């Protein structure tokens with residue numbers, strides 16, 4: 008009974024940012040060690056899961072021997088780059104997520120988003136425009152939209 | 153460079169039989185610790201790697217989640233099965249690990265992996281197609297992902313793949329195969345006024361479907377018209393004369409050079425396992441109409 012809200016509470020407790028992904032079932036090993044907190048209902052904003060409301064401490068009968076896990080924003084090796092442009096400040100944006108490079112959807116892309124990207128890459132921010140210049144469409148996944 | 157032959161020696165060195173499977177991409181833990189042996193050339197017939205050809209002496213860098221792991225024959229519960237297909241030789245693929253039944257992710261799945269799986273199960277290997285037809289999304293674990301097979305491996309687990317049990321995949325993208333003698337595959341055009349105009353209809357193993365027009369052009373339409381013997385294609389539409397029944401299954405094409413004799417010869421065509429809703433069916437009008 009793991010959920011995306013639970014990871015957000017865990018990430019915020021550890022000051023690790025936002026939960027970009029969570030790992031379910033026996034992802035990081037067969038169910039082992041003392042099991043303490045399962046089947047608690049959180050609202051997605053509380054600082055810590057124990058401080059978050061629950062049906063009661065120890066009120067859980069878990070089975071199947073699964074160990075939870077979570078990958079947060081600082082845990083993720085999130086990186087940005089520009090590919091297939093005239094210069095190093097032009098081209099198609101690519102973001103590395105889960106260890107694989109992927110592109111970004113064109114939906115909602117405007118000058119404010121391009122302003123953040125140019126500054127983040129270290130490129131000059133005097134004039135920032137959207138559009139991938141002469142670059143071609145990528146073949147990898149599309150992580151962001 | 154972790155070939156299968158010297159993985160058998162590792163299993164033999166521990167008196168655990170032969171290496172039934174190779175743990176791809178650091179299955180049994182993350183690579184905490186340094187390395188001592190790497191890139192040694194062993195024929196695999198040796199009793200131990202100690203008395204084997206060391207060849208060169210050098211050190212390089214490897215990913216901490218990209219270290220070695222082996223599964224010996226004694227600790228083997230692996231098996232392959234097909235579930236919820238039209239026939240026995242089609243449907244969703246499942247792999248048994250740790251006494252549990254789990255699916256396979258569709259990333260990295262192509263006709264080369266299908267050929268290994270169809271051969272392993274004993275199904276006909278004349279035409280091997282990816283995609284789960286007629287099946288639903290799986291339930292439970294997702295054991296394998298990004299399987300990379302050259303096409304001659306004896307079993308799927310011998311191939312390159314990721315760590316068992318950890319993947320970013322979702323149960324919607326579940327892998328299946330369709331293995332055929334190449335007897336049951338049929339193509340037709342319906343609703344256009346003759347046999348050389350209409351909507352492309354496929355019937356593979358007595359199940360009716362259509363072809364999505366996501367990557368449909370005149371180069372792909374030429375192969376169908378050539379296959380049917382209706383000359384070259386002219387346009388990707390037609391004038392309707394009747395109504396054609398609706399089906400749920402779909403056929404997906406990657407790309408065709410245009411000189412193929414049949415549609416089944418085009419590389420990496422998927423039968424089922426995916427739904428296209430922002431696109432329509434594929435329609436042709438050949439020149440012999």
Ligand SMILES: *[C@@H]1O[C@H](CO)[C@@H](O)[C@H](O)[C@H]1NC(C)=O
Pocket residue numbers: 091092093094141142143
């Ligand atoms: C875009 O133009 C640059 C600069 O001449 C060139 O290096 C690059 O290869 C071009 N990209 C494509 C996809 O043609």
Ligand SMILES: *[C@@H]1O[C@H](CO)[C@@H](O)[C@H](O)[C@H]1NC(C)=O
Pocket residue numbers: 236237238286287288
């Ligand atoms: C696939 O078709 C077979 C044979 O008609 C049927 O038994 C099965 O339930 C179908 N699977 C579905 C609809 O998921």
Ligand SMILES: *[C@@H]1O[C@H](CO)[C@@H](O)[C@H](O)[C@H]1NC(C)=O
Pocket residue numbers: 409411412413
């Ligand atoms: C079709 O053209 C491709 C690309 O040139 C070539 O490799 C292939 O052999 C051709 N096939 C036939 C059947 O002529």
Ligand SMILES: [Ca+2]
Pocket residue numbers: 258259325
């Ligand atoms: Ca996919």
Ligand SMILES: [Ca+2]
Pocket residue numbers: 260261262264265298299300301
């Ligand atoms: Ca592959």
